[PDB]
Design a protein around this ligand. Structure first.
Ligand SMILES: CCCCCC/C=C\CCCCCCCC(=O)O
Ligand SMILES: CCCCCC/C=C\CCCCCCCC(=O)O
Ligand SMILES: N[C@@H](CCC(=O)O)C(=O)O
Ligand SMILES: N[C@@H](CCC(=O)O)C(=O)O
Ligand SMILES: N[C@@H](CCC(=O)O)C(=O)O
Ligand SMILES: N[C@@H](CCC(=O)O)C(=O)O
Lengths: 398, 185, 398, 398, 398, 185
C-alpha cells in the first residue's frame, strides 16, 4: 500500500532538516520535492516512504553494459515505485519509463566564480560621452580654429593658427583666454563655439558622478562560444546527468566541440556530485566553469556566500519531471496532480519560498583610485612640456 | 637675501630632501591599517615590508606580497602594471636618484662656475623628482586601495616634505641660473 | 496507409495563409511554425498528414450545460480530426478527455497594452530644460542689457558691438575682454551676471535631472493594479484556457479580475485574438488584453509594432500536441517532440518565426544623436561667419 | 431569535450595493460595519436584521425633553436590539447603554477644501539657501571688499573701495573682473574668496533644480487655534453628533471659544448629515471647515475627487464602539467578539480594504512662471541704471 | 470606608520610585503617569487608595499546566489586590476572568533598535565629496604645475608668484590675468585646465549626490524583514501579552517569529523591559526588542537616547484599568476614565511624562552649519592677509 | 550711411513699432489654445478678449475675466498683483506710449535742432519701451500659465518685432546724439 519513493539529496530540492538525527521517517528530509511528493500522495491517495537513491545519482545508461544507474535504474529495476526529484526529461528516459508533465522548467547553464567588481578604469572620464562624440568634438574644435584663422586672415579689423587653437581650447575649458576676437565673423564663431561648450560640458558634468565610480562585473565568458573558444578555463558537468548525455548526443558545432574537449581533458572536468562542482568553481579561481541546470545556479547565486554567478542564456530549455515505471498505474494520477497544482498556483509559491525566501544577498566619496588617471595625464603633459622647452632651448643654443 | 646664501640653502635643502626620501623608502611606518597578519590586528605598514604591532607577533617585520596577493584574475589587465610599479617602487627611488644628482650638479656648479647650464639641469632634476614622487604617492594609494580605518605615518609626510623641498629647490636653482645669465648678460 | 487529419487554427505565426494561397492548394495553402512542426513530426512517425482549419476559429472549451467540446478539442474528441497541432494549452480539464504530448513551447498569461507616447529625445533635446518662452525672453534680455549698457556707457569701449559681446560672454561664462568702470555699467553687469547665474544653474541642474531620469513609468505594470483599475477594460478570449484559468482561479487578484470580466458591459471578451488586438490598438489606452506571452511578443515585433507586453507572466504553462484519448499515435509524437527539442529545432523555428522577421527591430553614455543639434548649429554658425567675412571683405575692398 | 440591528447610512461604514433595488434583505447594504456585524452574529450565535435608523441620526439627548434620538434612542427605547455603527463612545451614552471595547480609533479633525498647489514664489531662487546664510554671505562679501581695500592701501605694490566691491562681486558670479590683485595679501584674500564662491555656488546650483519648481500646499488653517483666531472661514459639525456635545461640554479655552462662535453664527454652520457638510466644504471655496471624525476625513481624502484634505492633528482621541441596551445579555459576547477579531487581525484587514483599496489618488521643464522673478530684477536694475546715469548727467550738466 | 488595594508594576514612566523615596513612605513613595491617574480616579469615585507593587515585577500571564494567574492579574483574580492601575494590555484571555475598563491609552506592538552611526554632516562637510588624499594630491599638483610653468616660461610675466596665481585662478574658474604665449606654458595650462575641469565637475556632481541624498536607510524597517533576518536576536517579555500575541498569532510573519523566539538559544526573552532595553543597548545591533510603542517612544526620548522605534506597529490595542470579575467598582471607574478623556487630562499627563522632559529634544534649504567651515576658512584667510600685509609694510618701511 | 538718412530710418521705425504695438494691444490673435468656452474647443485668444473659432459659437468675441476667474483663494497673495497687471495691460500700453513720445521727440529734434538732449530722451524712451514690453510678455505668460498645447499668433511676434525695433531705434538715436555732440565738440 505504501509507495517506495526514490529521490536524491540535492539542495534545494531535497535537504535533511537541522537535527535530523533526532528524527526518523519522512520528516528527516525537507525540501521542495518533499512538499510536492506529500501533496502528490495526498491527491492520488496512497502512502509513501522516501528513499535517497543509494548510488547518489540521477540516471544514465551504461554504453557497454546497458544498465540504468540511480533513480532511473531503481524504477526500471523495481527497486523503486516512483521518483519525485529534479529529474530531467529526455528521450532516452522516455523509452524505458513514463514521465509526467513538467512541474517546472529549466535550462543548461554556466556557473562561474563571481569576478570582482572591476573598479572603473583609468580614462573613465570619457565614459559619460560616447567615442563618436569625442571624435566629432575634436574634428569640430579643429574646424573652429581653422575657420577663425581663415576669417581673421581674409577679413581682419592676431589669430595665427596656434593662437586660434589656444582660444578655442580655453573656451572649451571655460577659462577665458586673454585674446578675444574683434571682428563680426570671428565673434560669431566664438559665440557658437561658446554655446557648444556650454551644452557639452553641462551634459558631461551632469552625468560625470556615477561614471567615475561605477563598478561593473565583466566576465571572461558570456556564452558557450567563449567557452569553446578557450581552454584556459575549463568546463565540466555532473556525471550520469542528462547534461552529459545531451552534450554527447549533440549534433551542433559548439556543443560537439565542447564535448570533445571535455571527453579528454586532464584532469577530468567531470564530477560525481553537484556540490563538488560548486566547490571546484568556488576554489578554482575562475579556471573552471560548471554546466548545470539553471535552478541550482539560481539558488546558489542567491544563497550565501553568493560567490557564484550564472552567465549566458540557457543553452537549451527543458523541464523537471516526476517519473514512474513503464506501464505503472501511477502515471495517470501523478499527471493530473501536477496539472491541478500548477493551475492552482502551488508550484509558483514553492518556487518563490524555497528560492527567494532564501535570499541572503549609495553616494560615496571619490577615491583617488577613481580619478587617478587624470593626475597621470597632468604629470605626463608636464614632463612633455619640460622636454619640449629643452628641445627648443637646445635648438636655439645651436 | 640672495648673495650666495641661496646656493648653500639649495644644497642643504637638496640633501635634506634626499635624506627624507631615502628614509621614507627605507622605512615601514607609511601606514597604520588593520590587517589579517597579526593573529584582524593592528599593523603599521610600509613601502617594502609590513611589520605588525599591538598583536601576537608584535615585531615580526614581514615582507609584503605585491603582485602575488592571490592574483586570481586580471593578469595583463592594467592592474598588473600598477602592481608592478608599486612593488618595484621605481618612482620614489627615481625621486631619490634625481635629488642626489641635483645635489651633485649643484656642488659641481660651485666648482666649474664657467658653465651655467649645470644649475639649470639641477633644477630640472629636482622638478622631475617632485613629479615622480607624487606619482609614487598616487600609485601607492591606488594600490593600497586593493572599508577599514587607515592613516599615514611620518614616513609619508617625509615624502611629502621631500616633494615640497624638491620643488622649492627647483625654484631657487632656476633663480640662480637667471641671475647667472643676467651677470653674463 | 491513410493521411492523418490535422486540425488547427489560424493564429499568426503558428499557422497562417500563404501569400497567394488562392494560387495554392492542399497542405501548401498555409505557412507557420506549427506547419513546419507537423511536417517534421509526420516525417519522423512516417505518415502522411492533411491540414485542416477548425471551423469555429476558436481553440476549445466546454459548454457547462450541454457538456460538449468545441473547436479543436471538439474536433478530436468526437473524431472529426485525428491530430491537433496548434497552441492548445494544456490544463486539467482538457487532459482528462484527450491525450496531450510533452510541450514544445512555454508561455504564460500576460498583459498587452497600446504603446503610450514615445516622447523620444530628439536632436534638439538640449533646449528642453528651458521652455521656448525662456529662450525667447533670454534673447530679449540680452538685447535689452546690451542696448542699455551701450547707452549708460556712452552718454569706454562699450559700443553696441562690444556690449553685445560682453553680454554674450557673461552668459556663457567664457570671460570678458572688458569690464565696466562706471557705476551704471557696473550695475547692469552685476545684474546680467546674477541673471546668468540663476538661469545657467537652473539649466544645468534640470539637465542633470533629464539625463539621469528617462522614461521609467507604466501605470498597470502588474496584475494587482490591473485588477484595481476601472477606467480600463481587460478580458480574455472565448473558447480558450485563459478564460478558463481566470474563471476557475482560487486567487484573490484573479478572482476579482474574473468578477470584473464576467460583468463588464460591453463584453470585454472577444472571439479572436485579432479582435482583441485591434481593440487595444483602437482602444486609446482603454483596453488591456490578457492573453498568452508568445503572441504578445510576436505582435509587439511585427508592424504596426504599436503594442507592448507588460508585467511578469501571471502563470506558466505550455502548448502541446493533442490526440484522442486512448489513441495509438501519442507515443511516437512525444518521442518526436523530445527529439526536436534536443536537436535545436524548436529553438530554430521560434527564432525564424518571431525574431528573424523583426518588422520593428543605470547611466549610459550619451549618443551623438542626443546632442547633435549642437553640431548642426555650430556648422551653421561657421558657414554664416565665412559668409559674413566675405561680405566684410567686399565692403572693405571697395 | 433574530436581532434588530440598528445602524446608519454613512460611507464607508454602511453603503447600499450598486443595483440594490434588485436586492432585498441584509444584502442591500454593504460596508465595513456590515462585515463586522455579520461576523459578530456568527460568533455570538443569533440572527440579525439590519435596519437604518429612521431619523438618520447617530444619537443625542434633548436638553429640554431629555429624549434620545437616533440609534441611541432606538436602543434605549426598545426599538433596536443592538447598534453596529461608527458610533462614538462618550460618558453620556454610557449612562444609558453599554458599549463595547473600541473596534477602531479616531479623532475629531478638520476637513478643508484642498488649496491649490501654490506655485513656487517669486524670489524662490533664495530657497536653496537659508536666510541666515545669505545674510552671512553679504556680511562676508562686504568684509572681503573692506579687507582688500585696507590691504591695498596700507601695503601696496588700484583697489578703491568700489573697485574692490566690484572684483569681489565678479568673483562670486564666476566672471573674472579685469583687475586682479598684485600683492601677496590681496592675492590671499582673493584666493579664499574664490574658494568661498566655489563651494557656495556648487551647493546652491546642486539643489537649485527642485526649489524653483517645488509646489507646496500651505493651508490657511493648521490647527484649532487658527480656526478660533478667525471668522473669515467658518467651522461647523454634524448635528446630534458626539462632536457637538464634546464641544459644548468642553472646559478648554479654544474649544469653548469655537463652541460660542458656532452656537450663534449665521447662517448655521451645523448640518444634518455628513455628506451635506462634505458638499458644503467642496463648494464653500475654503470659507468653510468641517469638524468630523478622522476616519471619514481619511476615506474622503483618498476617494475621488480627492478635493479635500485633513488638517491639524486630532483634537482628541476617541473610539468607535458597538453598543447594546443597558442590562442586555448581548454585551458580554459582542465584547469578546471584538477582542477575538482584533487579536486575529480582521479589523486591520477591513480597515485597509475599505480605505486603502479604495485609493484613487517627475522632472519637468522650467516654466517662465518659475524663473520670472529674476527677469523682473534684471529689468529693475536696468531701469535703476538708466535713472542713475541721468542723475549723474543732470548733476554734471549743472 | 476602607482604603482600596492598588497593585501595579515598576515601569518608567507609568510608575517609578521617587528620588529620595527612602525619605518617603506610603503612596508618596512612587511617581508616574498611573500614579496621578489613580489619584484622580479615586478622587472621582470618592475612595482612598493604597499603592502596592506586584511582587514578581511581571505583568500577568497564565501557566498552561497549573492554569494559575501571575503578576497583577494573579493578585486581582485571587483577591490579593482590589484594583490594577498599570499598563495591563487588554486581550481576550485576560478579559474572560476579570473586568477591564475602557482604555486610557493606545499602543501596539513595535520594534526597538540600537541607534546606528549618526554620520552627521559636520561643518567641514564640503570636503567629503573628495577624499583627504585627493585634496592633498591636488595641492601637490598645484605646486607642481606652478613650478613647472615658472620654469618653462623663464628659460613673460610667469614668475613663481604669478604662476601660483594663474594656476589658482584656473582651478577656481575665476579667470586669468595672464595667459601663456609659449608652447610649453600653453601645454601646461591646457593640462591644468583639463585636470581642473574633471576634478571640479566631479566635486560638484558628487556634491549634488550628497545634498540630494541623506541618510534614508534602515535594514529591518518592517516585520517581514525582521522575521527573515538571522544575524539578529528578537523576542518579547515574559509574563505579558506581547508574548501571548506572538504565540497565539495565526499570521505568517508572526507565526514564524514565534517559531524563532520559541527556539533561539540563549533565550531571546527577558524578565523585565529594562533587561531587554539594556540588552539592545549592549547588543551591538544584535538584539531587536519587540514591545509596546509607548515605552519605545519614552525610552527613545530619555537619555542615553540611544534607541529608536522602527517600523509601523504590528497591531493596535490599549491599556486599561482592571478589577476582579463581578466587582461593583467597574462602573464608576469606566465613567471616570471617560470623564478624564473628554476633559483633556490623559493628553496632559502623557505630554508631561513623555515629551515635557525631553532628555534629548524632499529638499530642504541648507543650514549654515552644513557650510560654516567655509566661513571659518575665509575669516582665517582674512586675518592672515592682514598679518602678511603688516609684515610687508614693515619689510618695505625699513 | 549716416548722413541724415539715420533720422528718417529712426522715425519710420519708431512709428512702425508703435503701429505694431498698437495692433498687438488692439488684437485678439495672441494665442491659439483650447478652452472651455466653445461648446473643450479651439480658441484664438488675446490680451483683452477671447474670441472662439472652429466651435459652435464660431465668432463670438467674448471679453475675458482676468481677476474674476473663480478667485477661490489668494487675494493679496502676490498673484493678485500679477493678475491686475495682466488685465490692465499697463506695460504694453506703456510701451506704446513711450514709442509715441519717442517719435514726437525725434520729430521735434528735426525742428529745434539747437537742443541735442531731445534725441537722447527719445532713445531713453524707446529703450524703456522695450523693457516694458518684455515685462508685458513675461506677465502675459506667467498669468496664462494659470497641460494642453498652445501657440503664439502674429500679434505676439508683432510685439516682439516692436521690441526689436524699439531697441534698434534706441541705438540709432543715441548714435545721432553722439554725432551731434561731436559736431558741437
Ligand atoms: C598632453 C597630453 C598628455 C598625455 C600623457 C598621457 C601619458 C601617459 C598616462 C597614461 C598611463 C596610464 C596607463 C595605465 C593603463 C594602461 O595600461 O593603459
Ligand atoms: C539692483 C537690484 C535691483 C532690484 C530691483 C527689484 C525690484 C522689483 C522687482 C520685484 C517685483 C515683484 C513683486 C511681486 C511679488 C510681491 O508682491 O512682492
Ligand atoms: N536533473 C538532471 C540533472 C543534470 C545536471 O544537473 O546537470 C538529470 O537528471 O540529468
Ligand atoms: N492557447 C489557449 C487559447 C488562447 C487563450 O485562451 O487565451 C488555449 O489553448 O486554451
Ligand atoms: N460617531 C460619532 C459621529 C460624530 C461626527 O461625525 O462628528 C457620533 O456618534 O457622534
Ligand atoms: N503591557 C503588556 C506587558 C508588556 C509586554 O508583554 O510586552 C501586558 O499587559 O501584557
Amino acid at each position: 500500500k505504501t509507495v517506495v519513493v526514490t529521490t536524491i539529496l540535492e539542495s534545494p530540492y531535497v535537504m535533511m532538516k537541522k537535527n535530523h538525527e533526532m528524527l526518523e521517517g519522512n520528516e528527516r528530509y525537507e525540501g521542495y520535492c518533499v512538499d510536492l511528493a506529500a501533496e502528490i500522495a495526498k491527491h492520488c491517495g496512497f502512502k509513501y516512504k522516501l528513499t535517497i537513491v543509494g548510488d547518489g545519482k540521477y540516471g544514465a545508461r551504461d554504453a557497454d553494459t546497458k544498465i540504468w544507474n540511480g533513480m532511473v535504474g531503481e524504477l526500471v529495476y523495481g527497486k523503486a515505485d516512483i521518483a519525485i526529484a529534479p529529474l530531467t526529461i529526455t528521450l532516452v528516459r522516455e523509452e524505458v519509463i513514463d514521465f509526467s508533465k513538467p512541474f517546472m522548467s529549466l535550462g543548461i547553464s554556466i556557473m562561474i566564480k563571481k569576478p570582482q567588481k572591476s573598479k572603473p578604469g583609468v580614462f573613465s572620464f570619457l565614459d559619460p560621452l560616447a567615442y563618436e562624440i569625442w571624435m566629432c568634438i575634436v574634428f569640430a574644435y579643429i574646424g573652429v580654429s581653422v575657420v577663425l584663422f581663415l576669417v581673421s586672415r581674409f577679413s581682419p579689423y592676431e589669430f595665427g593658427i596656434f593662437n586660434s587653437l589656444w582660444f578655442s581650447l580655453g573656451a572649451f575649458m571655460r577659462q577665458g583666454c586673454d585674446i578675444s576676437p574683434r571682428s563680426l565673423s570671428g565673434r560669431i564663431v566664438g559665440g557658437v563655439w561658446w554655446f557648444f561648450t556650454l551644452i557639452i560640458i553641462s551634459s558631461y558634468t551632469a552625468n560625470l558622478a556615477a561614471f567615475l565610480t561605477v563598478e561593473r562585473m565583466v566576465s571572461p565568458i558570456e556564452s558557450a562560444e567563449d567557452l569553446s573558444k578557450q581552454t584556459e578555463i575549463a568546463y565540466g558537468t555532473l556525471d550520469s546527468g542528462s547534461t552529459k548525455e545531451f552534450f554527447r548526443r549533440s549534433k551542433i558545432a559548439v556543443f560537439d566541440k565542447m564535448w570533445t574537449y571535455m571527453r579528454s581533458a586532464e584532469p577530468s572536468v567531470f564530477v560525481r556530485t553537484t556540490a563538488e562542482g560548486v566547490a571546484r568553481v568556488r576554489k578554482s579561481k575562475g579556471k573552471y566553469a560548471y554546466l548545470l541546470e539553471s535552478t541550482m545556479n539560481e539558488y546558489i547565486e542567491q544563497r550565501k556566500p553568493c560567490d557564484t554567478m550564472k552567465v549566458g542564456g540557457n543553452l537549451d530549455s527543458k523541464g523537471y519531471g516526476i517519473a514512474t515505471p513503464k506501464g505503472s498505474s501511477l502515471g495517470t494520477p501523478v499527471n493530473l496532480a501536477v496539472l491541478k497544482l500548477s493551475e492552482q498556483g502551488v508550484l509558483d509559491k514553492l518556487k518563490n519560498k524555497w528560492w527567494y525566501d532564501k535570499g541572503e544577498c549609495k553616494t560615496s566619496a571619490l577615491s583617488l583610485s577613481n580619478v587617478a588617471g587624470v593626475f597621470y595625464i597632468l604629470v605626463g603633459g608636464l614632463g612633455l612640456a619640460m622636454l619640449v622647452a629643452l628641445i627648443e632651448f637646445c635648438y636655439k643654443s645651436r | 637675501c640672495e648673495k650666495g646664501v641661496q646656493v648653500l640653502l639649495t644644497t642643504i635643502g637638496a640633501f635634506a630632501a634626499f635624506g627624507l626620501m631615502t628614509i621614507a623608502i627605507s622605512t615601514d611606518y607609511w601606514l597604520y591599517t588593520r590587517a589579517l597578519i597579526c593573529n584582524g590586528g593592528l599593523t603599521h605598514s610600509g613601502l617594502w615590508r609590513i611589520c605588525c604591532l599591538e598583536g601576537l607577533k608584535r615585531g615580526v617585520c614581514v615582507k609584503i606580497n605585491h603582485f602575488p596577493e592571490d592574483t586570481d584574475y586580471d593578469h595583463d589587465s592594467a592592474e598588473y602594471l600598477l602592481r608592478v610599479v608599486r612593488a618595484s617602487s621605481i618612482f620614489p627611488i627615481l625621486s631619490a636618484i634625481l635629488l642626489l644628482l641635483g645635489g651633485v650638479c649643484v656642488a659641481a656648479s660651485r666648482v666649474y662656475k664657467s658653465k651655467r647650464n649645470i644649475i639649470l639641469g639641477a633644477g630640472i632634476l629636482f622638478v622631475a623628482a617632485g613629479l615622480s614622487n607624487i606619482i609614487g604617492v598616487i600609485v601607492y594609494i591606488s594600490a593600497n586601495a586593493g572599508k577599514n580605518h587607515y592613516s599615514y605615518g611620518w614616513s609619508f609626510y617625509f615624502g611629502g616634505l621631500s616633494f615640497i623641498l624638491a620643488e622649492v629647490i627647483g625654484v631657487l636653482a632656476v633663480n640662480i641660473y637667471i641671475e647667472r645669465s643676467r651677470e653674463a648678460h | 496507409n491513410r493521411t492523418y487529419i490535422v486540425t488547427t487554427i489560424l493564429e499568426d505565426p503558428y499557422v497562417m495563409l500563404k501569400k497567394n494561397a488562392n494560387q495554392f492548394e492542399g497542405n501548401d495553402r498555409y505557412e507557420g511554425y506549427c506547419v513546419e512542426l507537423a511536417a517534421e513530426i509526420a516525417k519522423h512517425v512516417g505518415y502522411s498528414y492533411r491540414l485542416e482549419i477548425v471551423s469555429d476559429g476558436k481553440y476549445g472549451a466546454r459548454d457547462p450545460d450541454t457538456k460538449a467540446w468545441n473547436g479543436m478539442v471538439g474536433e478530436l474528441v468526437y473524431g472529426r480530426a485525428d491530430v491537433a497541432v496548434a497552441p492548445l494549452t494544456i490544463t486539467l480539464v482538457r487532459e482528462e478527455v484527450i491525450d496531450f504530448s510533452k510541450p514544445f513551447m512555454s508561455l504564460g498569461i500576460s498583459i498587452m497594452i497600446k504603446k503610450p507616447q514615445k516622447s523620444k529625445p530628439g536632436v534638439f533635446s538640449f533646449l528642453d530644460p528651458l521652455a521656448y518662452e525662456i529662450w525667447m525672453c533670454i534673447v530679449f534680455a540680452y538685447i535689452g542689457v546690451s542696448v542699455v549698457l551701450f547707452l549708460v556707457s556712452r552718454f569706454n569701449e562699450f559700443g553696441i558691438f562690444n556690449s553685445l559681446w560682453f553680454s554674450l560672454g557673461a552668459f556663457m561664462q567664457q570671460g570678458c575682454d572688458i569690464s565696466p568702470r562706471s557705476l551704471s555699467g557696473r550695475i547692469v553687469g552685476g545684474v546680467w551676471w546674477f541673471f546668468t547665474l540663476i538661469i545657467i544653474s537652473s539649466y544645468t541642474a534640470n539637465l542633470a535631472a533629464f539625463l539621469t531620469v528617462e522614461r521609467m513609468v507604466s501605470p498597470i505594470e502588474s496584475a494587482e493594479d490591473l485588477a484595481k483599475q476601472t477606467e480600463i477594460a481587460y478580458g480574455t478570449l472565448e473558447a480558450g484556457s485563459t478564460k478558463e484559468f481566470f474563471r476557475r482561479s482560487k486567487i484573490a487578484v484573479f478572482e476579482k479580475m474574473w468578477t470584473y470580466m464576467k460583468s463588464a458591459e460591453p463584453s470585454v471578451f472577444v472571439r479572436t485574438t485579432e479582435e482583441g488586438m485591434i481593440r487595444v490598438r483602437k482602444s486609446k489606452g482603454k483596453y488591456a488584453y490578457l492573453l498568452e506571452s508568445t503572441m504578445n511578443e510576436y505582435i509587439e515585433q511585427r508592424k504596426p509594432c504599436d503594442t507592448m507586453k507588460v508585467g511578469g507572466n501571471l502563470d506558466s504553462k505550455g502548448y502541446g500536441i493533442a490526440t484522442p484519448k486512448g489513441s495509438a499515435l501519442r507515443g511516437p509524437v512525444n518521442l518526436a517532440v523530445l527529439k526536436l527539442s534536443e536537436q535545436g529545432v524548436l529553438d530554430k523555428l521560434k527564432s525564424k518565426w518571431w525574431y528573424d522577421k523583426g518588422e520593428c527591430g543605470k547611466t549610459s553614455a550619451l549618443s551623438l544623436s542626443n546632442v547633435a543639434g549642437v553640431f548642426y548649429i555650430l556648422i551653421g554658425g561657421l558657414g554664416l561667419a565665412m559668409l559674413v567675412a566675405l561680405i566684410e571683405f567686399c565692403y572693405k575692398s571697395r
